[PDB]
Design a protein around this ligand. Sequence first.
Ligand code: HEM
Ligand code: HEM
Lengths: 145, 145
Amino acid sequence: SVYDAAAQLTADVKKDLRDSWKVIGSDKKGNGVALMTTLFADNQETIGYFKRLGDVSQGMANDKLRGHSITLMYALQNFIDQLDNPDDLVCVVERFAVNHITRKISAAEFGKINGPIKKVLASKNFGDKYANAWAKLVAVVQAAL
Amino acid sequence: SVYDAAAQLTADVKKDLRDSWKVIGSDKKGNGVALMTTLFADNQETIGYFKRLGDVSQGMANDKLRGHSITLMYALQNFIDQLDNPDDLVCVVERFAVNHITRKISAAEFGKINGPIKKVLASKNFGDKYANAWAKLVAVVQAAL
Ligand code: HEM
Ligand code: HEM
């Protein structure tokens, strides 16, 4: 249950999420694109899912990829802001899931985002403790896929 | 031309958008639902598009509608944040348009949101000047549909 997954977000976990987000979320365009480019670099098999974005090897220059990356970051902004109210977190996550389910993105495939997140966090000096916190947020979405 | 539409967002317009957003964007759940329920009240012919959300007449009590409403507000948050850079505003508007286009939403359809926005702003003591500012932002989206 998505609700059961949201239970893993204890006070300490929510604290690390907000603290780290104040930094990585402060530069959505730069960090969002870093996330996507890292995803494609370490998981080439996922490139096929994003054919609508054109040539993703163009990075920042690709306007479609840039728009997707910035938008992706606002979905994370949404999750972070609903952390204190499980009911709101759950309804936003379930809607979010709808389109990813239609695209046939399994819970395991979605989990591939953990790698890129860990690296982006590391680039800002946020270690394993923070990566584990983020993996728990991602697990909430996985519970809905 | 989406670019020409975005060029209509002058200094005064951007300032008015930010000032009003400071208030309405502070309660995304409340004002998001208000915007959707006003839309369904003023333009019943649009309800058919949200069939997946169940009984939208339930407003806040409808989990799916609440989830959609909160998420809608983050798209607006996204647009407001890109006001400093037209290139970034345009690229996010174009990705946003993609799903609405797939849903066959035309520019004539999308413009119906101007009424509800004007009413929500008014409920928060924001008059004509602000309603006109937001109409210009909506115009950017319409130009991409
Ligand atoms: C932190 C995790 C992620 C977030 C916050 C995120 C967010 C989003 C958002 C906001 C959209 C745009 C709205 C829509 O659904 O149409 C989207 C689209 C999409 N996402 Fe995710 N996503 C994430 C991870 C992934 C992963 C891991 C995959 C697959 C490997 C994936 C595949 C897709 C695809 C195929 C689209 C459609 C792009 C297009 O062709 O327009 N997403 N995602
Ligand atoms: C300021 C105006 C609006 C904003 C900011 C907005 C925002 C959004 C967002 C963020 C989504 C979720 C992501 C996606 O699936 O693309 C969405 C979905 C949707 N929008 Fe829009 N939208 C607006 C107006 C409208 C209007 C006027 C219509 C129709 C007349 C419309 C119809 C839809 C539909 C059918 C969905 C899918 C809902 C669901 O099944 O969960 N939108 N919109």
